[PDB]
Amino acid sequence: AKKMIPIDDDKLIMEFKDDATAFDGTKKARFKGKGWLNAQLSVIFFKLLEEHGIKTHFIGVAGGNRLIVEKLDMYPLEVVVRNVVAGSLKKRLPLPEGYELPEPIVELYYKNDELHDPMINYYHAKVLGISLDEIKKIEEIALKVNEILKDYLAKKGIILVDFKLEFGKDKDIVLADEISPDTCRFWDAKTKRSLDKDVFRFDKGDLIEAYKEIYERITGEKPEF
Amino acid sequence: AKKMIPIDDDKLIMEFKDDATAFDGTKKARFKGKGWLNAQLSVIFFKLLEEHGIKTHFIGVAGGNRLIVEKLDMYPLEVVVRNVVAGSLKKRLPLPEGYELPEPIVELYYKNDELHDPMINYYHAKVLGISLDEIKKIEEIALKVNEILKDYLAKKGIILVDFKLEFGKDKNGDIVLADEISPDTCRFWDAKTKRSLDKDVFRFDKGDLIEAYKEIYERITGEKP
Amino acid sequence: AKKMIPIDDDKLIMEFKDDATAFDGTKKARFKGKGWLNAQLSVIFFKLLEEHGIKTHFIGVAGGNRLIVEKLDMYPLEVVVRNVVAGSLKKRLPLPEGYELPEPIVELYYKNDELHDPMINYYHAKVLGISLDEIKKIEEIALKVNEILKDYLAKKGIILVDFKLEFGKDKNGDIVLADEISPDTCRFWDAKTKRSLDKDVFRFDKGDLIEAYKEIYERITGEKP
Amino acid sequence: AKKMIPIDDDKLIMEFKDDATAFDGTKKARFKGKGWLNAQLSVIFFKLLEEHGIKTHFIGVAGGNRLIVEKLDMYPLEVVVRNVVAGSLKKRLPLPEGYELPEPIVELYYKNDELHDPMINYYHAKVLGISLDEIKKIEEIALKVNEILKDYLAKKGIILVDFKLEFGKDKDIVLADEISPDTCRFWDAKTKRSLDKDVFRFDKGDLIEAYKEIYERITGEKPEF
Amino acid sequence: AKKMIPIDDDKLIMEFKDDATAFDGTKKARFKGKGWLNAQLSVIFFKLLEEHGIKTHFIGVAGGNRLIVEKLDMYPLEVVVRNVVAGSLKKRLPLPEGYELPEPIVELYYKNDELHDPMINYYHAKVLGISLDEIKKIEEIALKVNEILKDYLAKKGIILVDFKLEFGKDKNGDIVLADEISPDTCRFWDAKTKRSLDKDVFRFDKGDLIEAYKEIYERITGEKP
Amino acid sequence: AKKMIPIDDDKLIMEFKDDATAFDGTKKARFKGKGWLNAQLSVIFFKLLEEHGIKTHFIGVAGGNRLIVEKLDMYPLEVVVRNVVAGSLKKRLPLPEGYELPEPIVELYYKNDELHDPMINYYHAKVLGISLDEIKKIEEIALKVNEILKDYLAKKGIILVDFKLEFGKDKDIVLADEISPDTCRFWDAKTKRSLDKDVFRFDKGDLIEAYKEIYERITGEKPEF
């Protein structure tokens, strides 16, 4: 759903596609507009966070579905922040779906398609080369990012249930990858319906529909091109 | 394989049985002698650790397969310490079986038969009620225990690959090591051959269980049971 | 605007009045309903915070304008938390009115009518008897309280610009939030218009006080008093 | 009373004048010798501190009233250390003039003529770009400097009541500006009369008189040229 | 030179004698007045420190050469604080006699006549039962005491070169300064001449002991005994 | 027993000799093979530690008795780690020879032939220019190194009683000098006889004999050339 195209040593282009993928490829479809929407929600989000002094890889926009992003020495981590009990958190804690966590939970995953992204802790993280200090900073950034996204979305009747972040090191630790309904769980505050990729993962409705809603609610206008 | 029989408010009897169980009960057998051997290896281990000022629940022996143990407010934790890459750690790190970790790894499992003992971090731990301070103390005790057991077994040509501890709180608020310490709950490999001298022998039918446990016992005490 | 009536050693009555005071008494008026509204917004706030395990002095309600509150060893502090640049923070930082702070600011005031509540730091705090540990805890509680109030009001289109807390010590030695939490002690702005819905309306004659406080109440409870 | 004349990228000349200024310019005079005395007490002080491994901007002397000083990236801070209750500390704490503080007090001021140097804390300091770590180091240096100046002056019957410091960053945090009866409060130990700029601020005697005394008591000789 | 006479469980009498001892008893003499002077300088010092909230064992005076002191669980420590290079510190650092240390040095000695008071570190300290926390507190008290004694003596032209403290635990668990504080246990030099006004005068026959101690007393109290 | 021959700015040759020295030169002999054995046990040890990510000065082997070693800014420290009570530790603690320490002890010595390597603490260490942070890292490395050497030697029936380390700073803190029976105390686990330089220091047997034993027990082959 994303392709990374190198420019030079400092920067590259991140290209958002219309291809949507679930369950390791076994489920696939294409949604006209998804790429544009995802790139654009990413820009909105990265700029919002950068307003609060969050350092992000975002440099500029290169057309509707392409971002220009600074080049990074990437951590082999997928970091998940959770405000509301959903998905695999059910398999880990005795709490029903939708339960509001008293504090956000940070989970670390070793980014590794083959091991199917296994959860690790600080000891595994060290083995993979990430120091305790880096870890602590990564978690602190994530929770700072969690607070800004959650408060921002909540004012617009959107629940940030959870989301995934990636990070890398500039030549300082830097937030990377994307921030889109591909990588977050959003629920309508009133209804609790998904407005994210879960709609496609579990055929609970129209995907392009739900993503346009996010876009509409944030910008206050329908999606163009 | 263990039955807890209450006595009063301060203490209880832990009774080691000959029934052996794997894979949630779908694999079962009985090994004459296993109970006695497990109780006795536990006494040896608890007393050795208590020599180094490790607080344990062990009070005394009540016949060959029963231990008298102090009654605790138990942590809903299974704590795993790992010196050598084996088992599920292969699913978590890109490392072959038998690889010697540069430092020991500590993992936390939410003790819950239903969720099949899922792995948790400090954030999940708090949700379940365990403060960061208790966690830190639990991990430090576990690593202290890991060092005493590992050094001791290695002098006798035994590798402490990994092992599982449980803990509870006594009525001063002190954190206390509990459950058992036996070839049911540790991974021991012969140093020369790398064969298992633990429950793995029963789990995977790689030989005679009673045989491997007698070996542990023989190598430790120096006496053939 | 508040009168403290002692009951016994553990508890007292806090009574909210209709008398409103500004600029050390040189400006005064009476607003029919103000007392009832302030008592009631305080109950709402204390109970909301107590839902998140914030320890407060609130025990129960004793009629429309009286609260039953637990008796404390009070800190000679007024603690101010700030999300948005307003008031005297303009005199302290080169920032326009309405500027959104990237993080909340905590200020400490020595509670003393004579010195007209001067600002102090940790060093002054110690001189007055408050240890560095207590200070740290006070600021952490205040920031926790700031986050719960801010998120809650913002869902209802209300900006928590700033607010003042007081604290005291109960008879376990636990630090306890006290005084009141009302449009007398917070700065609330309508999110869309930025008008004041607090005492600033009375301080600077920018409208109808009873009107703005009823608004807070209406938006929160959803019921017109 | 000081003029900064640039040389190059690494260094500059600090020139001490005879012009004395109080209350933002509204009070002014000229004192023949003041510039010379101030430069010379600065040298004495900077060299004394540099004896104890305090890093200072002082490089050399360039004539009687000119110092050669290393160029710095300056903190927008005026940092005040206080041993004895005097001046505006009276407006902040319920203590009489002359009271000996049980510990020195450090106060931070935002250096800003327009806001008339307002007091800030660690949160304001961050907003202005100064990290908590820098702050902590700045305070630690100040208190180290406070101890050396206080002990040194006390042996010569002089009380270091308080004083102001400025700091900057070399290309390490470095003590800067000046250290003179313009920037410290000195009291005669026996009499409690001022031997500093307070003499000029409040017309309590002859300024050039009091400064010569400091010089005389320190060096053990009258002032030349 | 001191005899401890038990009274009861809370308190005892410390009695200062005229017998003076050096080099493990191989050098001995008697100085009429020494006991009285040592008891009295100790009272002065303990009361001065107790003015700054230093907890000491001093309860009251019981005649000219006896002190009433609170009974303690004593640390097997002699703790030495050093401002100026003298004695055995010459054997440890490449520094001439009289060199002024940039910071005070704290040394720990295992109090044991047999091993002739060997120097230990934190690791030896633990072996002997003293936790790292107690050690840290002991050193912080010692450095606080060092600063109060040093400043006080220096105003009177006396250099606190070094001195030895002992400590014990009272029955709240609070750490308490004990033994004595006298020219037997400190090194004092006249500021101008650098001659000794302490036991060094007796140790090395460099003058009249009773003479130097009377000097300390005279300079402090201002009264000739 | 070692000669340092410079190559260039990054590296040098460490040459192991057959000359053995004790008691500052007053005792000397030559042992054919000692140099070879010492170089070779050093290589074994440095490579073993470097397997665990311990940074060492070892670069390569240059013939049987010469090591190629990276050039360092050396700490003026001899750091001693002790597992078992022996030598001068007897003069510092009331414990018999051979007593197993409950935790390893780290001692610091100022490397200085003239002062005959005196013990220092953290305060002396600072005076000599070593910061508290460096010290803490040096001790942590030493204890990590202590654990790897001790466990490794214990499996082969050898007790690591104590040993000395030196460290320096690359252009990171780096383990340096040598690791040989010249710089460690080894005891046979069964007999408690020395297998180190103590054999030569106190004429308790054949030196070349004991060192060959270490070599034999480690490699599993007799010594060649």
Chains D and B are touching, with contact defined as 3 or more CB–CB pairs separated by less than 8 Å: no
The minimum CA-CA distance between A7 and chain B, rounded to whole Å, is: 31
Domains located in chain E, CATH noted: 1-72+209-225 (3.30.200.20), 73-208 (3.30.470.20)
Chains in contact with F, where contact requires at least 3 CB pairs less than 8 Å apart? B, E
Contact B115 A92 (CB under 8 A): yes
Q: Rounded to 5 degrees, what are φ and ψ at C43?
A: -55, -50
Contact A120 B91 (CB under 8 A): no
The alpha carbon of E24 is separated from its chain's Cα centroid by a whole number of angstroms, namely 18
Tokens 């935002």, residue located: D110
Nearest one of A164, A145, A144, A25 to A88, comparing CA atoms: A164
Q: Would an 8 Å CB–CB cutoff place B192 in contact with chain F? A: no
Beta-sheet strand order (sheet of A2-6): A2-6, A11-16, A66-70, A58-61
Q: Would an 8 Å CB–CB cutoff place B124 in contact with chain A? A: yes
Tokens 């330089």, residue located: F197
3-state secondary structure of C5: strand
Note the resolution in Å, 1 decimal. Answer: 2.3
Tokens 């709609």, residue located: A199
What end-to-end distance do the CA atoms of chain B give, in Å?
Answer: 20
CA distances from F73 to B69, F119, F174 (A): 56, 21, 9
Q: Would an 8 Å CB–CB cutoff place D129 in contact with chain C? A: no
Tokens 């800067």, residue located: D176
Disruptive mutation site among B100, B120, B121, B146 for chain A (greatest number of A CBs within 10 Å): B121
Tokens of E60: 């009251």
Q: Would an 8 Å CB–CB cutoff place C108 in contact with chain D? A: yes
> Which residues in chain D are closer than 8 Å to E51, comparing Cβ atoms?
none
Chain D residue nearest residue E159, CA to CA? D155
Chains in contact with D, where contact requires at least 3 CB pairs less than 8 Å apart? C, E
Q: How many CB pairs under 8 A join A and B?
A: 63
* Residue type, position B66, single letter: R
Strand ranges (DSSP E) for D17-117? Answer: 19-22, 27-30, 58-61, 66-70, 73-74, 77-84, 100-110
Strand ranges (DSSP E) for B62-190? Answer: 66-70, 73-74, 77-84, 100-110, 119-120, 158-165, 167-169, 175-177, 186-190
- Whether the CB-CB separation of C32 and C210 falls below 8 Å is answered with yes
Of D52, D53, D154, the CB nearest to E151: D154
> Residue E72 gets which letter from DSSP?
-
> Residue B206 gets which letter from DSSP?
-
Chain F residue nearest residue E82, CA to CA? F123
Alpha helices in chain B (DSSP H): 34-50, 122-127, 132-154, 200-203, 209-221
Quote the crossing angle between the two packed helices D132-154 and D34-51, to the nearest 10°: 110
> Which residues in chain D are closer than 8 Å to C123, comparing Cβ atoms?
103-107
- Whether the CB-CB separation of C164 and C156 falls below 8 Å is answered with no
- Whether the CB-CB separation of B15 and B5 falls below 8 Å is answered with yes
Q: Is the dihedral of CA C78, C84, C87, C90 positive or negative?
A: positive
Q: How many CB pairs under 8 A join D and E?
A: 15
Task: Tally Cβ neighbours within 10 Å of residue A55.
Answer: 15
Q: Would an 8 Å CB–CB cutoff place B91 in contact with chain A? A: yes
Tokens of C46: 């204390």
Cα(F84)–Cα(F163) distance, rounded to whole angstroms?
A: 11
Q: Helix and strand tally (H, E) in chain D?
A: 5, 14
Chain F residue nearest residue E109, CA to CA? F92
Disruptive mutation site among D150, D155, D160 for chain E (greatest number of E CBs within 10 Å): D155
- Whether the CB-CB separation of E161 and E82 falls below 8 Å is answered with yes
Contact A118 B94 (CB under 8 A): no
3-state secondary structure of A8: coil
> Which residues in chain A are closer than 8 Å to C155, comparing Cβ atoms?
154-155
Chain E residue nearest residue D148, CA to CA? E102
Which residues neighbour D112 within 8 Å (Cβ) at sequence distance 6 or greater?
C94, D76, D118
The minimum CA-CA distance between B85 and chain A, rounded to whole Å, is: 11
Q: How many CB pairs under 8 A join A and C?
A: 15
CA distances from F198 to A94, B59, F87 (A): 62, 44, 10
Q: Would an 8 Å CB–CB cutoff place F156 in contact with chain B? A: no
- Whether the CB-CB separation of C101 and C46 falls below 8 Å is answered with no
Element spanning E188, H or E: strand E186-190
Cα(C201)–Cα(C206) distance, rounded to whole angstroms?
A: 5
> Which residues in chain C are closer than 8 Å to A151, comparing Cβ atoms?
150-151, 154
- In this structure, the strands spanning B175-177 and B167-169 are antiparallel
